[PDB]
């Protein structure tokens, strides 16, 4: 499961739901271990949907948990992202993954 520890302010009612396209200011961060990625870099804040099974699983469970302006801190299984396969080169089999989710978004 995904276990939700979101830093308090925003507004906690503006759920997500399908049919709706949303803005993360997310970053990766491998546990015991360095970043892999950040969306605050390229500053483009990736834009996606909901539903559409564009994320992990991981991330999609974590997204809907959320509401506007919230600052989550997730905490992703291996067996919803990569713990069988590992992203090649990127991500290390069997591995656990932590992200800084920042929600906001439109829709």
């Known amino acids: 499961g995904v276990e939700i520890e979101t830093i308090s302010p ?3 009612r503006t759920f997500p ?3 709706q396209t949303c803005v993360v200011h997310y970053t ?3 546990q ?3 970043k892999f990625d950040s969306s605050r870099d390229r ?3 990736f834009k996606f949907r909901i539903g559409k099974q564009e994320v992990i699983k991981g991330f999609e469970e974590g997204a809907a948990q959320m509401s506007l302006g919230q600052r989550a801190k997730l905490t992703c299984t291996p067996d919803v992202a990569y ?3 590992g992203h090649p080169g990127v991500i290390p089999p069997n591995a656990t993954l932590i992200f800084d989710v920042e929600l906001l978004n439109l829709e």
Do not use: Q, S, V, W
């Open 10 to 12: 925003g507004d906690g």
């Open 17 to 19: 739901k399908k049919g």
């Open 28 to 30: 990766g961060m491998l």
């Open 32 to 34: 015991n271990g360095k």
């Open 43 to 45: 500053n483009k804040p």
């Open 83 to 85: 713990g069988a396969t």
